[PDB]
């Protein structure tokens, strides 16, 4: 019964949880393969973007808030960088638990 | 041990409220897999 | 005989039944055999006898 | 199945509970004390194991439904014990609440306070209020009356704060239980269970009550007292007879209730039903319906169903009671010595061992003596190979399947699989008739069962099937231009006839 | 787009990228090592 | 008991019909609002409202019915209950639950119901169509059967025949014929129709 | 599909009550009625009901079975599918003196 | 009595659904959500339903549940459950494809 | 004393069973076996040991 709910969390069914998700990240075991090809990436790009087509989910998603954030954890990061793991700044957490 | 883990049930009184896999495979319910976590619904008009 | 087609599995009443004037009956019998102009059609023809009753007929 | 007989009531839930006598004495069809089955022709013996009572039989009818063989459900019926039977399946537990009695004060060997305290948990542990269940320990402000008080201010709090936790959404009212919650109570309990045997004296009265032995074959013994609690009892081994435990038990059952209630269940009981000492006890087995006895064909002669054999015994048993016990009525009571008290006390032992054993024998043939191979009884049936649940229900043959050697092939596609003519003109996928297909079903069931594409049936409106078996063009030809026929039942007017096309390379197959 | 879809039963799923590999570990090439270790 | 072994109480049918308009018939006519649970074909997915009439309502009108207590006569505004419980009554457009197996789908709606509920005890008029040696049969506002048994008549009466090509006679002398005015002693329902048994006495 | 809709899928009857699809069985119809599907364990004799007492009795709540004993009540009753090896289960439960009783809905 | 009943399950059952406007979940039609609706909703053009698009020559409940879809006509919904009796109500239509 | 030869059951009973043994497989041994081909065409079978 162990499954993905629509929060995101990994839950059995029961609703007791398990994981808050899949891999810490919840990436597809399948569509990773190319994930950071980066090279075979910029290489049939225009390929690429015609088949994901940001023009339709424009309206849809949210293309800001997420990223401000992106921007303050790896300035804190760089920061609180040196020092060991039990000093860690907790001040600011993943992009993805927000 | 199919047998005792029912005794577990019934000198707790247990609720089965037919949940896990397992659970549902005997009553026949579908499972909470995939096809099993959402539902269906008919935008029917002419009821107003 | 009765399926779950055409027969609801359970139904029940919300409030108390409550009593009707002779009116009130005929101003339903029209209304009701207005609106259904197949089987409702045999049944219907049983109800305008009953209107025809509510006046003083055969 | 069909996609045009849906039902929109289900069950939601499942619960486990014992058989009173009651529900059963009410349900039952009929009563069974006769070991013969058959007479002397082939005919269900009337009080016989296949009374027709409990299921249509042969080529006879259900007396109790009027339907056949075929359409019968079967109906429970039963078989009263003329003396109660310790349940095999719990007498472990039993044989616990028994030895923490005490046969004085009718109540548990432990503690009383301590008991309450127990209780309180449970009640919150079926809440989820796992800190409260420990915050509640934390009492002893500050002889006899200051007890009163301390099983008062403990109460009050676990109740309040029970309260406390429905006000916001924490708790339902059915309760609330994960995984977590689970746990610390099937801890706790276990934990009430060891605090209830330990105890030897008894705390709240101060008396000693003489330990019971046990066998595996379920048989209570009972040793007599010690020195030192012979003497301390006045300053305050043998058999003993399945009854003699329930009355005991049934006392103790109905004084300390109160936790009882909070032992035997993980939810608040919305139902507010009493708990009794009787649930261990049969006094009435469930005949099954005959449909389920039904017994085997070693092609041609006739085997009978094993379990019904296992009954039979219980029976034969069962009677020779009501005669020893109607015997007993006839031994004037001036006659009767103290000593032939003795003899008699055998006999009556005996009776409630053999009719126990026999009992088992059909539950778990473990706790049943030996004929040497033994009979399966309901324990080694639900555990059968994987397990009934695993070799019938997670594990079960179907229909509409077919296994066949597998052999190369570079001409069809990857997300191909090669169809073999035997195959495809016997599996066939039921397709709704309507307008789009009405020109292919047509076609179809023209060219019958043997050409392929085509079919082999039509289920009309009313679910009726139509072999177009060993049909030929015509009658085909007509029941063909038939498929879009209006609806003679105004009930399933909605419905349209399907027909059970050949495989075509249309569909999909796993 | 790469994301991992709201269901699947990645618990069955794994149970499968276990126990299927495991049927490479019927040979042997210090510690514990193999269908054993996973007994463990 | 405790509660259980005194709630078959609720079953004693909490609608007393009068004998008030003094014609000395009782009023039995009711207004009964009810829910509804039923299903829809996948052809009346447009037409919805229609669909519940054609093969839920219709097949009840002058059908005794065990729920209601009485015969369906007809109903009064059939509304629907959208499954999505936020939406503005309005929106010509409501969801509602589809079946798993099957495309069919389920709703609760209310609708009024009128309905003749007569309970044993009440008193009624009916116009005689037969007589025979052992009943008297009546119909009650032209449309439902009735019989009165043999020993229910008054033990008084007097019974006759013709020949020329049955027929009773009251008290006195009068062959009694049209306007008979006896009262509900049992109901059968559970026959094709409706019936009726009543008397005439003390 | 491949565990019930061609294996051993059935529809049987359900007591709303008790939830209980052991007990549930046809009604012995007079001659000229139709079959109810009744809750033995929730009935009553009409006998043993006569003896609660000031209302009058009612028809479409009697019924008898093929014995030729009149009952009443306990026509709360439903539809639903299950595989049938669980009927069988119960049975052998119930043997044990084990009752399974599914809420059943839509209460 | 079953009037206060009725009251309580149709307040509890709003209570639960999550407004249009608070909707924190993936506009992305989804694996399992796709399978079924071409499915279902087959079931139902295969039984006489509604078809609000030109079959063209379809002799196939599905396939033509397909060609449906595509242009977006499929008249459906999917309640969509949080492992908590919770859920928000998606249509068809106001899902992205893919 | 009437229980000084009265019977025990553990005996009585091993006489009673031996009998009923008999009239239950002689019983179903003049006995035929109806097919009832299930409303289906599948047919039900009159076993008790599928072991597959
Ligand atoms: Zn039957
Ligand atoms: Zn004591
Ligand atoms: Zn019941």
Known sequence: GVHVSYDNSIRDADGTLVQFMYGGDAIDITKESHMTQFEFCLDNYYALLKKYNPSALIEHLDVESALKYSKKTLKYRKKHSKEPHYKQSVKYDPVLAK | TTCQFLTKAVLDNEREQLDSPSARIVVGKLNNVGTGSFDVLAKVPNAA | ?58 | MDISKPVGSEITSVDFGILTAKEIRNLSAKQITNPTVLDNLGHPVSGGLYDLALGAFLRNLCSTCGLDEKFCPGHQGHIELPVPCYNPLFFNQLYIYLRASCLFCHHFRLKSVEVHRYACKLRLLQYGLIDESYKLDEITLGSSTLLNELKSKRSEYVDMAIAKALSDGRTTERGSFTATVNDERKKLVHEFHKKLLSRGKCDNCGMFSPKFRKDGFTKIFETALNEKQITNNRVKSTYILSTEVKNILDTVFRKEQCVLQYVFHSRPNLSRKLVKADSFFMDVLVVPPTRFRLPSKLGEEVHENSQNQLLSKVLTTSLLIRDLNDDLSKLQKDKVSLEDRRVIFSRLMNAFVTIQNDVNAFIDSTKAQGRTVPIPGVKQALEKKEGLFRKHMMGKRVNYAARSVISPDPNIETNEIGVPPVFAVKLTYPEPVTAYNIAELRQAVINGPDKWPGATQIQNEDGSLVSLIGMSVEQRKALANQLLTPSSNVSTHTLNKKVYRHIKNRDVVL | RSLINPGEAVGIIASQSVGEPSTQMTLNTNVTLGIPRLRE | ?202 | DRLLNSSDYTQASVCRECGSILTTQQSVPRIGSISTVCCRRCSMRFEDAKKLLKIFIDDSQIWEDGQGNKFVGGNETTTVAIPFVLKYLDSELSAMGIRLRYNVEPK | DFQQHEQIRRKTLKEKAIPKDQRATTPYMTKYERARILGTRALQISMNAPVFVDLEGETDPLRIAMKELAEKKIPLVIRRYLPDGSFEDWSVEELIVD | ?52
């Open chain 3, 1 to 58: 005989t009765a399926t779950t087609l055409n027969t609801p599995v359970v139904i029940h009443a919300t409030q108390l039944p409550q009593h009707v004037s002779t009116d009130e009956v005929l101003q339903f019998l029209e209304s009701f055999i207005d609106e259904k102009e197949t089987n409702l059609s045999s049944s219907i023809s049983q109800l305008k006898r009953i209107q025809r009753d509510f006046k003083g007929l055969p």
């Open chain 6, 1 to 202: 008991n405790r509660e259980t072994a005194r709630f078959i109480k609720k079953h004693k049918k909490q609608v007393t019909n009068p004998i008030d308009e003094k014609n000395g018939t009782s009023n039995c006519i009711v207004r009964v609002p009810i829910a509804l649970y039923v299903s829809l074909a996948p052809m009346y997915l447009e037409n919805p409202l229609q669909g519940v009439m054609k093969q839920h309502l219709n097949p009840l009108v002058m059908k005794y019915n065990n729920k209601v207590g009485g015969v369906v006569l007809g109903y009064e505004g059939l509304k629907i209950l959208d499954a999505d419980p936020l939406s503005k009554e309005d929106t010509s457009e409501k969801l509602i639950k589809i079946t798993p197996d099957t495309p069919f789908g389920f709703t609760w709606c209310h609708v009024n119901l009128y309905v003749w509920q007569p309970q044993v005890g009440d008193v009624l008029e009916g116009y005689i169509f037969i007589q025979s040696a052992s009943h008297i049969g009546l119909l009650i506002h032209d449309a439902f059967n009735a019989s009165i048994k043999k020993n229910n008549i008054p033990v008084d009466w007097t019974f006759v025949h013709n020949d020329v090509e049955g027929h009773w006679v009251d008290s006195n002398g009068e062959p009694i014929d049209g306007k008979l005015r006896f009262t509900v002693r049992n109901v059968h329902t559970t026959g094709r129709v409706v019936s009726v048994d009543g008397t005439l006495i003390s």
């Open chain 9, 1 to 52: 004393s009437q229980a000084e030869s009265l019977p025990i059951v553990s005996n009585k009973k091993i006489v009673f069973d031996d009998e009923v043994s008999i009239e239950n497989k002689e019983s179903h041994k003049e006995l035929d076996l109806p097919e009832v081909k299930e409303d289906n065409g599948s047919e039900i079978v009159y076993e008790e040991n599928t072991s597959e």
